[PDB]
């Protein structure tokens, strides 16, 4: 038993190693690494001692049964897909939430969670929006950034923290986490002029305005 | 006792596995040899045109021996001579295609048909796009798509081409067994041309699409598959 090394091929593009088969033979050094060459428990009973059988026969049979599937390969479950951002969403970016009950409001993106969903707080002192998950696609991302690299979001908040339970009352750790994150977000956006009025004011379309022509 | 039979069948399985591995190294280095051959065939004629120009002479190139023939006009109202020559060229449906090697019999056969076909001198990339993209094999007179090399090897192993690479090599450098290789490939079925034809019912010289595009079939295969 040895500790596993990482891959000696750097990935050149996906699916192609940068080193060929012979060069990788040389780097792995196979020239000096060649080689050549349950169901029953017995339980005592106070009689005799009985051979008890785990995983017994079935008591019942459904009168006809579906067959097995042909088995295919690339169909992974959701908890282990790869997760992508757009290029325009980096942490610190102001987003425009387009679809929820918080529709049209400018907010401050924080983090890409483990289950694909963006973490959002346009801090609820400003526009009454808490720590909320929001999907990547349902969001216009404008080009306005803050210097969020020096903040510490709490580690103990993920999709399992924001996932719905089952009226809904606001638990105390929600407002404690809310205060502890916006208390270091919001003084960093008070240093930017007229930004708190921006995060208060909502995005909407007027006459004579067209999203293809308007750059943000 | 079975402790001999399982060892023997494992030896047999391992033996045919080593056999398959040696065949894969075979067709690998055949593809490498072919790439070397096509560098040689592409640079040789450039080098010889250069030596002719630096001598002050000219260099008439090799008159091309391989054409790709696309059916351009439809079923209805075919003169029966032209219908028979199309049935021998295996262009039945509209926008099919077939490779054809050139000689004196074949050029007259194409020229009887020539208001109904567009036929040109295909590039090596055109032969690749046609074989990998649409190339299906006539096996047991059925149309089985050429997914893997065994479908080629079982039908043309007697003519000593095994994989898709020496299939393409025979067809491009028109080999000895070009007749049976081209008869193995099903008539190619191409889509309608993206962008569009300029005019169907006239020749390519007079600003149309039928006839003899010479090299300009390599701008029409690219948008018909």
């Amino acid at each position: 038993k040895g500790k596993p090394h990482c891959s000696r091929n750097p990935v050149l593009v996906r699916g192609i190693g940068r080193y060929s088969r012979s060069a990788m033979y040389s780097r792995k050094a196979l020239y000096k690494r060649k080689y050549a060459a349950l169901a029953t428990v017995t339980k005592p009973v106070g009689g005799g001692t009985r051979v008890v059988k785990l995983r017994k026969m079935p008591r019942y049979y459904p009168t006809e049964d579906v067959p097995r599937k042909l088995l295919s390969h690339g169909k992974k479950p959701f908890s282990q897909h790869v997760r992508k951002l757009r290029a325009s969403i980096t942490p610190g970016t102001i987003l425009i939430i387009l679809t929820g009950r918080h529709r049209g409001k400018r907010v401050v993106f924080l983090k890409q969670l483990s289950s694909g969903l963006l973490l959002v707080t346009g801090p609820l002192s400003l526009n009454r929006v808490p720590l909320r998950r929001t999907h990547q696609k349902f969001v216009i991302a404008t080009s306005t950034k803050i210097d969020i690299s020096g903040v510490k979001i709490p580690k103990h908040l993920t999709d399992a923290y924001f996932k719905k339970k089952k009226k809904y009352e606001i638990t105390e750790q929600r407002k404690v986490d809310q205060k502890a994150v916006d208390s270091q977000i919001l003084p960093k956006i008070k240093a930017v002029p007229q930004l708190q009025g921006y995060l208060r004011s909502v995005f909407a379309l007027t006459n004579g305005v067209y999203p293809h022509k308007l750059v943000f | 006792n079975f402790a001999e039979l399982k060892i023997k069948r494992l030896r047999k399985k391992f033996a045919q596995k080593m056999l398959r591995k040696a065949r894969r190294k075979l067709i690998y280095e055949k593809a490498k040899h072919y790439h070397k051959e096509y560098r040689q065939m592409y640079r040789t004629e450039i080098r010889m045109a250069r030596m002719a120009r630096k001598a002050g002479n000219f260099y008439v190139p090799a008159e091309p021996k391989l054409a790709f023939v696309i059916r351009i006009r439809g079923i209805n109202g075919v003169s029966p001579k032209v219908r028979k020559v199309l049935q021998l060229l295996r262009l039945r449906q509209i926008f099919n295609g077939t490779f054809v090697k050139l000689n004196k019999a074949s050029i007259n056969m194409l020229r009887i048909v020539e208001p109904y076909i567009a036929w040109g001198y295909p590039n090596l990339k055109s032969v690749n796009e046609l074989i990998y993209k649409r190339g299906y094999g006539k096996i047991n007179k059925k149309r089985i798509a050429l997914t893997d090399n065994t479908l080629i090897a079982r039908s043309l192993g007697k003519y000593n081409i095994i994989c898709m690479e020496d299939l393409i090599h025979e067809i491009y450098t028109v080999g000895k067994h070009f007749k049976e290789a081209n008869n193995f490939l099903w008539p190619f079925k191409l889509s309608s041309p993206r962008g569009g034809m300029k005019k169907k019912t006239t020749h390519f010289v007079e600003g149309g699409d039928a006839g003899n595009r010479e090299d300009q079939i390599n701008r029409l295969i690219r948008r018909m598959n």
Binding site: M57, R59, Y60, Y61, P62, T63 | -
Partner: protein, 124 residues
């Protein structure tokens, strides 16, 4: 023989019933109750059958014996099984398997026995 009888009873029987683009046979020893060569139960030398008991508890499993083929009174043997649901299936499974008694339909017999047992337990 058996295929000779099947090519006769195959279409013109009285147990056969044909409607709604389906087909069946109401014959007394038909596991899965359908018109087929294998599952038919009058044309074979050896044949299991699964019937519910006369009283409302258990399964009578019917065996066709080997000796008296043309003697229909002493041709079948009933065995009444009034047990827990697992060991009823275990008895039918051992009965068909370890006798090597027509093993084509051990699974059909235990399907039919399971269906009869769930019909015989009380209804919610």
């Amino acid at each position: 023989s058996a295929h000779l009888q099947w090519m006769v009873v195959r279409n013109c029987s009285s147990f056969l019933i044909k409607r709604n683009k389906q087909t069946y046979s109401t014959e007394p020893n038909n596991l899965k109750a359908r018109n087929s060569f294998r599952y038919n139960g009058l044309i074979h030398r050896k044949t299991v059958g699964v019937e519910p008991a006369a009283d409302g508890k258990g399964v009578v499993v019917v065996m066709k014996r080997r000796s008296g083929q043309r003697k229909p009174a002493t041709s079948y043997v009933r065995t009444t099984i009034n047990k827990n649901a697992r060991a009823t299936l275990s008895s039918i499974r051992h009965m068909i398997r370890k006798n090597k008694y027509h093993p084509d339909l051990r699974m059909a017999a235990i399907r039919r026995a399971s269906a009869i047992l769930r019909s015989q337990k009380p209804v919610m």
